């Protein structure tokens, strides 16, 4: 049990970038201007502190968004190509035992629908494609794989649980239960009551269910 919640990253000008988007994805893309990237997480109420999504190396997304963010002048196409095919080779047993956090950027924004931020979008090793929808959002805070990645590439730290004692957050991650904050009308709760909280908030707006 935990949450999938719909990510999603916006696009302006729909019509121009339909060249690299697959056929039954174009109807939400030009009448929504979104593609949606479905997130499983047991840490719902860590929402609020996303800084960046990542999609396993053989998620169908990657290259979608990676030809769209090579469009935009972000991107590097060949080198998300050559870790794509490189992570292939690679069982189960030898990504999760990886001392090192190897990814590569896509070129896209994600919006949080928790905040409306827009955060970066990777594909990195740590994250297998098997496991819930082959994507996750990151809270380098909270997520102590997260936080290592995004030390490894500059990525930014927001603290959303705030722990009862004292904690360095450059330093390493809390990832235990504490009170939000910087988490809009759900700052003061608890962690355990916010995640049904946020959940049930985000199903309410189509862009979040139970599991």
């Given at each position: 049990?935990?949450a999938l919640i719909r990510?999603?990253?916006?696009?302006?000008?729909?019509?121009?970038?339909?060249?690299?988007?697959?056929?039954?994805?174009?109807?939400?893309?030009?009448?929504?201007?979104?593609?949606?990237?479905?997130?499983?997480?047991?840490?719902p109420?860590?929402?609020?502190?996303?800084?960046?999504?990542?999609?396993?190396?053989?998620?169908?997304?990657?290259?979608?968004?990676?030809?769209?963010?090579?469009?935009?002048?972000?991107?590097?196409?060949?080198?998300?190509?050559?870790?794509?095919?490189?992570?292939?080779?690679?069982?189960?047993?030898?990504?999760?035992?990886?001392?090192?956090?190897?990814?590569?950027?896509?070129?896209?924004?994600?919006?949080?629908p928790?905040?409306?931020?827009?955060?970066?979008?990777?594909?990195?090793?740590?994250?297998?494609?098997?496991?819930?929808?082959?994507?996750?959002?990151?809270?380098?805070?909270?997520?102590?794989?997260?936080?290592?990645?995004?030390?490894?590439?500059?990525?930014?730290?927001?603290?959303?649980?705030?722990?009862?004692?004292?904690?360095?957050?450059?330093?390493?991650?809390?990832?235990?239960?504490?009170?939000?904050?910087?988490?809009?009308?759900?700052?003061?709760?608890?962690?355990?009551?916010?995640?049904?909280?946020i959940t049930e908030w985000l199903q309410?707006r189509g862009l979040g269910e139970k599991?």
């Open positions: 049990e935990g990510f999603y990253v916006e696009i302006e000008e729909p019509e121009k970038f339909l060249n690299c988007v697959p056929e039954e994805l174009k109807e939400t893309l030009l009448k929504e201007k979104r593609i949606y990237i479905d997130v499983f997480t047991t840490r109420d860590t929402v609020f502190g996303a800084t960046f999504v990542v999609l396993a190396p053989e998620h169908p997304l990657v290259p979608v968004l990676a030809c769209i963010g090579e469009r935009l002048g972000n991107a590097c196409y060949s080198d998300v190509e050559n870790f794509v095919e490189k992570m292939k080779k690679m069982s189960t047993r030898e990504r999760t035992m990886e001392e090192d956090k190897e990814g590569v950027f896509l070129g896209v924004y994600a919006t949080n928790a905040n409306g931020e827009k955060i970066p979008v990777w594909s990195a090793n740590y994250v297998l494609y098997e496991y819930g929808t082959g994507a996750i959002m990151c809270v380098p805070a909270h997520d102590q794989r997260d936080w290592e990645f995004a030390k490894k590439y500059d990525l930014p730290i927001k603290v959303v649980v705030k722990p009862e004692g004292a904690w360095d957050f450059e330093k390493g991650a809390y990832e235990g239960k504490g009170t939000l904050v910087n988490s809009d009308g759900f700052d003061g709760l608890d962690s355990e009551t916010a995640k049904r909280k309410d599991k």
